[PDB]
From Swiss-Prot, chains A, B, C, D:
Protein name: Ferritin heavy chain
Keywords tagged on the record: Acetylation, Cytoplasm, Cytoplasmic vesicle, Iron, Iron storage, Lysosome, Metal-binding, Oxidoreductase
This protein's encoding gene: Fth1
Subcellular location: Cytoplasm; Cytoplasmic vesicle, Autophagosome; Autolysosome
Lineage: Eukaryota, Metazoa, Chordata, Craniata, Vertebrata
Native source species: Mus musculus
Known partners and oligomeric status: Oligomer of 24 subunits. There are two types of subunits: L (light) chain and H (heavy) chain. The major chain can be light or heavy, depending on the species and tissue type. The functional molecule forms a roughly spherical shell with a diameter of 12 nm and contains a central cavity into which the insoluble mineral iron core is deposited. Interacts with NCOA4; NCOA4 promotes targeting of the iron-binding ferritin complex to autolysosomes following starvation or iron depletion.
Annotated binding of Fe cation 2, by residue: 58, 103, 137
Main enzyme class: oxidoreductase
Major subcellular location class: cytoplasm
Length: 172, 172, 172, 172
């Protein structure tokens, strides 16, 4: 085993690798959303900027997870990054709802990772997950819920003014 | 009696304590409004900021009243701060109308306090009420009336764009 | 349920509301202490400043708790803020001892909240309580214990010089 | 009559002259207190500084009253400035108590002046008295009451340390 490895279960290492892949997949999904909103028939600059920034933060989360895995003496094993479920997101509101669903799924995987670290008596992994991944995820979920609520209130996507004004005011 | 007490009726002291409680209750009501507008299914950041600022100003008014009561030689007696009448305010326009009603009620209590100080021949208390409480209250009433008029003109709350644009432009 | 609510028990939401009310009550108690120490027959400026600052920090704690409740998808329900047990605190030392007792009670409620979040498997709520409410409370308890020890050592309240010199040196 | 005189009763002018004399007498009393505390067998530098500053503020109040009398078209008639009741004030606490009594007497004369201006329907004189003479007087009364309370609590004048430490800390 690794010379630095201490109180690190193999199940926790496998779960960390799975979470790395999930964060990379979320980054890919946000990249797809930004590419959709950069289209000429969509033309929402701040929506694309928002989703590109989200993609970069998901990549940063995956990088920090790989740094944690190396720093605990684990071994990083990378899998295929699956393509996003769709290439056309049909709306700003629909993309925000899909991003909310993805964020909740990532949060659920983080919760199961914290539970697995708890039952394995891994206080460092639990503290890492709580400090760097749980609060940020809950903040992102709240922000996406606020965006979805505002976009539904304005009347998106049937009201054409709604997505434009949300792009100008909230995301700009 | 207090060594500093001079030309301070007991009725005026009791009315000052009642006004302290009323200002604290108004602060609690504004806190409730801000909490409502911070919800995920409401999501009006500047509405919540406005009502939180109003809560802090109401608390400051209560603190100034308690400072006046101590500075005149009276004794502060604190009562229970009653909970606000409702927890769900249903709209930005409805919350503005309720805040206008609360501001008018506080203004009316201040007017009766000034009348009681006048009939007791208390020029210092009258000057204190006029300088620090009456003009600010009338300004707040005018501002809330302007907000209510604008929100009704825009078509709140049936028009979803109206509350969002008022949040962005007037309160932002 | 809320669109952002995930891994948030109803028992935890009710306990958060109860803790909100307890923090508001503690703020009211500290306000009462500051009002007592601003009296003409007491005249301890730095004691009043200390207790007013404590009241403001308790209000800030309650505001952070309501922000957490909204940010987790819970619903804030406000109760009556009960009046403090007494209006005359009789001494600086007695007020410090009562503040220590109140701080220990708030700490105990926070401990039960953390236990309830632990048995409900709520790592985000546990991390929130540990990061923002436990360490600060233990620091406040230690500071109040130090103040009480110093005031008893100097001979408060029978020694009139003791409370004055503590007001000038420690709290000033 | 004066070319600028308008809505200025002769009773109000006489009361203003009497108040001018009373403020000058208060300035003389504070000068006497400062001279007492500059003595070699008393030796309280900050007590003397406090009472000299009070004398200068009383002179400023008398000058403002004379400016008001000239500005309303009245005529200033100066009387003899009576000597203070005593030259030996025996203590810092006793001097603070005598200053409190003098401040309350000046406040009472100001209250009767405001009542006379009210019954004569003189809103400018009432506003002048309220703005420049009532609030400052109540603040001075509260400050002197706080000083007296602190000095009695410390054990002045039997405790020799008390007046020295009050001179160093509160007045310094």
């Amino acid at each position: 085993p690794s010379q630095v490895r201490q109180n690190y279960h193999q199940d926790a290492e496998a779960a960390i690798n799975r979470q790395i892949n999930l964060e990379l997949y979320a980054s890919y999904v946000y990249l797809s959303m930004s590419c959709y909103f950069d289209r000429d028939d969509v033309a929402l600059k701040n929506f694309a900027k928002y989703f590109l920034h989200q993609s970069h933060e998901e990549r940063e989360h995956a990088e920090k997870l790989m740094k944690l895995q190396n720093q605990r003496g684990g071994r990083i094993f990378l899998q295929d990054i699956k393509k996003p479920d769709r290439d056309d997101w049909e709306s700003g509101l629909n993309a925000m709802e899909c991003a909310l669903h993805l964020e909740k799924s990532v949060n659920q995987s983080l919760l199961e990772l914290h539970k697995l670290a708890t039952d394995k008596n891994d206080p460092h992994l639990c503290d890492f997950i709580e400090t760097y991944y749980l609060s940020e995820q809950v903040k992102s979920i709240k922000e996406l819920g606020d965006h979805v609520t505002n976009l539904r209130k304005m009347g998106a996507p049937e009201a054409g003014m709604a997505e434009y004004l949300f792009d100008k005011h909230t995301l700009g």
